[PDB]
Amino acid sequence: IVGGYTCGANTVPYQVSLNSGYHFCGGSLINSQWVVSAAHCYKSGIQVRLGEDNINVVEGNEQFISASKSIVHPSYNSNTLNNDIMLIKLKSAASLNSRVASISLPTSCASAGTQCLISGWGNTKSSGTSYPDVLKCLKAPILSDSSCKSAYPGQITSNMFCAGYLEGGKDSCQGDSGGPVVCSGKLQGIVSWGSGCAQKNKPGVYTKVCNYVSWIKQTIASN
Numbered sequence: 717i718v719g720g721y722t723c724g725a726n727t728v729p730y731q732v733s734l735n736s737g738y739h740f741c742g743g744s745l746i747n748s749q750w751v752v753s754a755a756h757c758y759k760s761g762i763q764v765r766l767g768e769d770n771i772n773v774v775e776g777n778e779q780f781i782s783a784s785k786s787i788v789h790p791s792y793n794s795n796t797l798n799n800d801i802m803l804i805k806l807k808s809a810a811s812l813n814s815r816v817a818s819i820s821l822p823t824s825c826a827s828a829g830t831q832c833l834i835s836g837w838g839n840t841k842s843s844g845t846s847y848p849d850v851l852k853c854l855k856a857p858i859l860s861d862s863s864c865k866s867a868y869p870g871q872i873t874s875n876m877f878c879a880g881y882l883e884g885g886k887d888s889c890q891g892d893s894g895g896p897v898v899c900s901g902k903l904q905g906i907v908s909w910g911s912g913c914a915q916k917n918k919p920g921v922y923t924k925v926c927n928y929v930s931w932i933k934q935t936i937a938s939n
């Protein structure tokens with residue numbers, strides 16, 4: 717997260733860290749047994765880490781659970797990142813508590829202008845590399861689809877939306893992938909892609925979760 721702020725230990729209890737010997741992507745707990753992340757974060761051998769703040773220090777509120785199965789969206793296109801969403805099931809249910817909680821799915825999509833909270837352990841430098849060990853947060857509004865499509869001509873589909881600032885300075889970045897974009901208490905987005913980080917006229921692009929609610933519900937009930 718570039719231009720963001722330290723969230724504060726466990727203030728975003730639904731945030732998860734996907735670990736394969738190291739943290740490689742973020743994710744969101746939707747219930748005691750299921751996590752939603754980005755399809756491009758797909759990998760074999762994933763351990764889901766919950767109740768995390770500093771990812772390099774065992775602080776006492778963590779829950780480390782292995783993934784039993786991963787399901788990438790049937791229409792995921794790795795070339796364009798359209799349908800960038802994947803569901804991960806935990807080998808055993810997590811114990812929900814004040815520091816480990818699930819995030820609600822949207823009943824409807826949000827509109828441009830709505831403020832959202834994006835979080836992660838990704839790079840904090842636009843022109844450089846510096847990875848924080850504690851969770852970073854960023855408040856940013858959903859931008860109009862016209863602003864989004866003007867920035868990325870011919871690359872934005874109906875399954876995507878832009879969020880951030882056209883002036884640059886604040887944006888998600890490498891390492892934030894798969895992380896949550898929560899607006900009005902609902903999971904509205906998943907950190908997907910962008911062009912660099914915090915660059916003028918190059919906002920972040922996110923998977924539009926509201927379009928996948930039915931798929932999510934059907935898939936988790938049958939697995």
Ligand SMILES: N=C(N)NCCCNC(=O)[C@@H]1CCCCN1C(=O)[C@@H](CC1CCCCC1)NCC(=O)O
Binds near residue numbers: 797888889890914
């Ligand atoms: N930058 C912002 N605002 N948010 C960070 C999102 C992180 N996602 C990626 O880096 C993804 C991860 C999967 C590989 C690609 N990669 C990118 O962002 C690519 C985007 C392109 C990949 C192929 C489909 C078209 C878009 N580029 C990164 C960059 O431009 O720096």
Ligand SMILES: [Ca+2]
Binds near residue numbers: 772
């Ligand atoms: Ca820790």
